[PDB]
Design a protein around this ligand. Structure first.
Ligand code: CLA
Ligand code: CLA
Ligand code: CLA
Ligand code: CLA
Ligand code: CLA
Ligand code: CLA
Ligand code: CLA
Ligand code: CLA
Ligand code: CLA
Ligand SMILES: CCCCCCCCCCCCCCCC(=O)OC[C@H](COP(=O)(O)OC[C@@H](O)CO)OC(=O)CCCCCCCCCCCCCCC
Lengths: 84, 157, 162, 99
């Protein structure tokens, strides 16, 4: 696949496995991932300092939803503007 | 003749990157953390560990029980004291992985348990990073596809 | 493929050569020189089989003298005289140097150094049966001897005792 | 024809079938296993590692198998080894309740 594109909007095929996913699915999931991820970071690090005996694996895993939400909102915009 | 690699082998960018990230960097870093935990750190606390006895000598009394039970904080308990005399048991700890920061007071150098943990942590990141590119199983990225798509839509690039 | 009957075998493995069950899920054969790999497998087969036989026998039976009376195989290494080991090494060395040309020529057939003293493989059809069975016993011996060695390291007991 | 949400349009149905039949088979063996929490702890860690070490390899080979399915050289869930599917779906809902 040639992924080169012109104009203002990429053509959905840049999303790979997620090319057929609807715009609303991406947009809602991006908000959820950002809020849950932000909460994990807050609970882990900001609500009381992190200690050697207070590392929750779920909060560490959950923190990865913050960068993931970025990707989801870019994909959401791409689908929105492509009509999907 | 029968072992000269083809030009196609030399231009297999995705496979080379996967192996160099996960293997050459990642696994090498993991093996070095192994050396430190099994040999360097015991030797620093006055204990001989070599090829002769290393199969029978646990790096930590608890063994790998805490590891498989996810009780990883056990490996941080009991660091070398600030009065530890390097290459002796006087003031020595049991911890194999730590995040103390700064210097051992006697040797004026970074703690060995910090160095072991550094190498273990980056090994994980490197091994994960080396699953990015597409080889023989359809998952992963093409380098050509990433590059062709990176044009700022405003046209300044 | 046969060994993995849901997957397809790689292109190199057609099912003609001895030892071919189409077992190469990683598709190593696509990149690797197969002729040499076959020679390498057969070599590991033959070393493992001698090693497997050696392990079980020198537990029971022994060469005369106190030096060669160690039931544990891995404990026997340090007891046996160095000059004894040098002669075995020099012997193995001479064989490997003699055979080196053939190995990298790829003229003769993998594992074939023209060694049939007694003339057991007279017929080509018998040779085929023997060649497959060499690999089969060899593959089995390769696992077994690694089984034996690891077991000794773990337990500290000779194969029969444990 | 039961796909309200529409995953078969998003993701390939062959892949979803492989996932379905896998859940079905794991769940049923568990349902039978439950009948025939403490055992998670009681069993030695060495034994548990061997279970993981065999599920891995089988799952690594399943990646190569999924390739054949998605290329169209293999039936979804065939390892050369409706009743399966119906009983499987029931066992999956049952297995949650037991856990
Ligand atoms: C302004 C900055 C910017 C913008 C607007 C874009 C925009 C784009 N990028 Mg680019 N990218 C950028 C910076 C940017 N990029 C940078 C700095 C890098 C690293 C050098 C990349 C690396 C990159 C790659 C590798 C790819 C793109 C792709 C794209 C296109 C599709 C995006 C997508 O599919 O999202 C949807 C993405 C997701 C839903 C995934 C979430 C993001 C990741 C996974 C988070 C990281 C998680 C963690 C570290 C990894 C998992 C660990 C563990 C769980 C295993 C889009 C045109 C795609 C493309 O070009 O198609 C041909 C593509 O394949 N980008
Ligand atoms: C840092 C930025 C970055 C970005 C923007 C992406 C973006 C993407 N990745 Mg990549 N990935 C990344 C880092 C990134 N990745 C890293 C560090 C790894 C190593 C763990 C991977 C390993 C990875 C794999 C194995 C795959 C992706 C895939 C994807 C695509 C679909 C993901 C999705 O959620 O759809 C919903 C999307 C274009 C998938 C894809 O479609 O690639 C073409 C895919 O199969 N990613
Ligand atoms: C696990 C798989 C694996 C491994 C281990 C390697 C390893 C290597 N390959 Mg690669 N290769 C592979 C798979 C692999 N390859 C595959 C699948 C392909 C085909 C796709 C290739 C294709 C390929 C080609 C074409 C070439 C190589 C080459 C090399 C060598 C690079 C030179 C070197 O020694 O860097 C060693 C580098 C490191 C150890 C990384 C560490 C360095 C960074 C900067 C980190 C910081 C260092 C650290 C602080 C150290 C402190 C040290 C101490 C003094 C305190 C290296 C031996 C090259 C070569 O030299 O061949 C003879 C070469 O030309 N490979
Ligand atoms: C290979 C990587 C790996 C990783 C990252 C983990 C990580 C974890 N394990 Mg697991 N474990 C593993 C392999 C791994 N395990 C293997 C191979 C086995 C044998 C099957 C187990 C058997 C096991 C048990 C019995 C338990 C854990 C538990 C845990 C969690 C610890 C939670 C806690 O109590 O504090 C943590 C998420 C604990 C857990 O999940 O409690 C909520 C727990 O009780 N693990
Ligand atoms: C050093 C040992 C060794 C070597 C060089 C080989 C080499 C080979 N095997 Mg054999 N195999 C072996 C041990 C070995 N095997 C053992 C112990 C068994 C019993 C489980 C088998 C069972 C087996 C079957 C059923 C088949 C093969 C086949 C092959 C050939 C093609 C596949 C391949 O590329 O493998 C490359 C192998 C290596 C580069 C060495 C192994 C490295 C792995 C990663 C070790 C991991 C575990 C520790 C190749 C000549 C196929 C064939 O066509 O035979 C003619 C075939 O159908 N092997
Ligand atoms: C790779 C194969 C291999 C290797 C490295 C060894 C290595 C050893 N053997 Mg063993 N052995 C082997 C195969 C092997 N053997 C085979 C196939 C047999 C036939 C049953 C024996 C029968 C045997 C006996 C009875 C004794 C040894 C003994 C030994 C040790 C000292 C002297 C010696 O070499 O006798 C080799 C003896 C032979 C009769 C020649 C073997 C035939 C070759 C492989 C051709 C040495 C550690 C001695 C020892 O100290 O063990 C505790 C000893 O008493 N070996
Ligand atoms: C071809 C002529 C030849 C000659 C003259 C010798 C002579 C000797 N061998 Mg050697 N040996 C030979 C071939 C030969 N070997 C070959 C081909 C192998 C490999 C199959 C060996 C494997 C071997 C071992 C393992 C040992 C000897 C040992 C000896 C010495 C003591 C044996 C004795 O008679 O009491 C003696 C100097 C022994 C020794 O080194 O003396 C302490 C001893 O332990 N030999
Ligand atoms: C194919 C060869 C093979 C070999 C040599 C072993 C060997 C072993 N197994 Mg394993 N096992 C195997 C296949 C094998 N297993 C398979 C295919 C499964 C999945 C069904 C298991 C599931 C299993 C469990 C659950 C346990 C063992 C355990 C053991 C050890 C002690 C058993 C005993 O003597 O009582 C022993 C090292 C036990 C152990 O780890 O000892 C502490 C143990 O609890 N095995
Ligand atoms: C409960 C009902 C059930 C039914 C009707 C089936 C039916 C089927 N299975 Mg499945 N299977 C099941 C449970 C079931 N399975 C479970 C619990 C597992 C996990 C071990 C599997 C694991 C499995 C694999 C790996 C494979 C099959 C395959 C098959 C198909 C062909 C082989 C066969 O006839 O064996 C069915 C035998 C029985 C139902 C008799 C069992 C009665 C007792 C236990 C004896 C057939 C449609 C093959 C297939 O073609 O996949 C699509 C195949 O490769 N099965
Ligand atoms: C205080 C305000 C701080 C944030 C200001 C952001 C201005 C964004 C301008 C976008 C428009 C623009 O001029 O973009 C210039 C360029 C981005 O170009 P792109 O073509 O990627 O932008 C396209 C989008 O603006 C619309 O699709 O760089 C930046 O935006 C750098 C950050 C500023």
């Amino acid at each position: 696949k040639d992924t080169f594109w012109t104009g203002k909007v990429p053509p959905s095929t840049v999303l790979g496995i997620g090319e057929k996913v609807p715009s609303a699915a991406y947009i809602i999931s991006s908000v959820v991932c950002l809020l849950v991820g932000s909460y994990c970071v807050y609970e882990s690090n900001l609500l009381s300092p992190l200690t050697v005996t207070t590392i929750n694996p779920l909060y560490v895993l959950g923190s990865l939803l913050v960068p993931y939400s970025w990707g989801l909102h870019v994909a959401g915009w791409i689908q929105l503007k492509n009509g999907k | 003749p029968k072992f000269k690699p083809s030009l196609a082998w030399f231009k297999n960018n995705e496979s080379r990157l996967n192996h160099h990230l996960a293997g050459l960097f990642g696994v090498s870093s993991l093996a070095w953390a192994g050396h430190l935990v099994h040999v360097a750190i015991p030797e620093a606390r006055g204990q001989h560990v070599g090829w002769d006895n290393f199969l029978s000598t646990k790096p930590h009394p608890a063994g790998l029980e805490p590891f498989f039970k996810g009780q990883w904080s056990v490996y941080a308990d009991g660091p070398d004291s600030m009065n530890h005399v390097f290459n002796t048991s006087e003031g020595a700890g049991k911890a194999i992985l730590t995040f103390l920061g700064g210097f051992h007071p006697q040797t004026k150098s970074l703690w060995l348990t910090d160095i072991a943990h550094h190498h273990l942590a980056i090994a994980v990141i490197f091994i994960i990073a080396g699953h990015m590119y597409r080889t023989n199983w359809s998952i992963g990225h093409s380098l050509k596809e990433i590059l062709d798509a990176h044009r700022a839509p405003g046209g300044r690039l | 493929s046969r060994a993995l009957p849901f997957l397809e075998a790689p292109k190199k493995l057609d099912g003609k050569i001895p030892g071919d069950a189409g077992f190469d899920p990683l598709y190593i054969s696509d990149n690797m020189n197969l002729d040499y790999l076959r020679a390498s497998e057969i070599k590991h087969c033959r070393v493992a089989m001698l090693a497997a036989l050696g392990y079980i026998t020198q537990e029971f039976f022994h060469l005369p003298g106190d030096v060669f009376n160690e039931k544990h195989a891995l404990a026997a290494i340090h007891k046996v005289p160095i000059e004894g080991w040098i002669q075995i090494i020099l012997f193995i060395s001479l064989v490997e140097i003699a055979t080196f040309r053939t190995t990298f020529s790829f003229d003769r057939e993998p594992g074939d150094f023209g060694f049939d003293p007694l003339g057991l493989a007279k017929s080509p059809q018998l040779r085929r049966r023997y060649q497959e069975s060499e690999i089969r016993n060899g593959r089995l011996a390769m696992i077994a001897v690694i089984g034996f060695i690891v077991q000794e390291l773990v337990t500290g007991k000779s194969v029969v005792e444990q | 024809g039961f796909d309200p949400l529409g995953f078969s349009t998003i993701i390939d149905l062959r892949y979803l079938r492989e996932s379905e039949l896998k859940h079905c088979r794991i769940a049923m063996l568990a349902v039978v296993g439950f009948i025939v929490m403490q055992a998670i702890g009681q069993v030695p860690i060495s034994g548990w590692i061997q279970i993981f070490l065999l599920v891995a390899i089988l799952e690594m080979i399943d990646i190569a198998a999924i390739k054949e399915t998605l290329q169209g050289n293999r039936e979804p869930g065939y390892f050369g080894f409706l009743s399966e599917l119906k009983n499987g779906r029931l066992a999956m809902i049952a297995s949650i309740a037991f856990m």
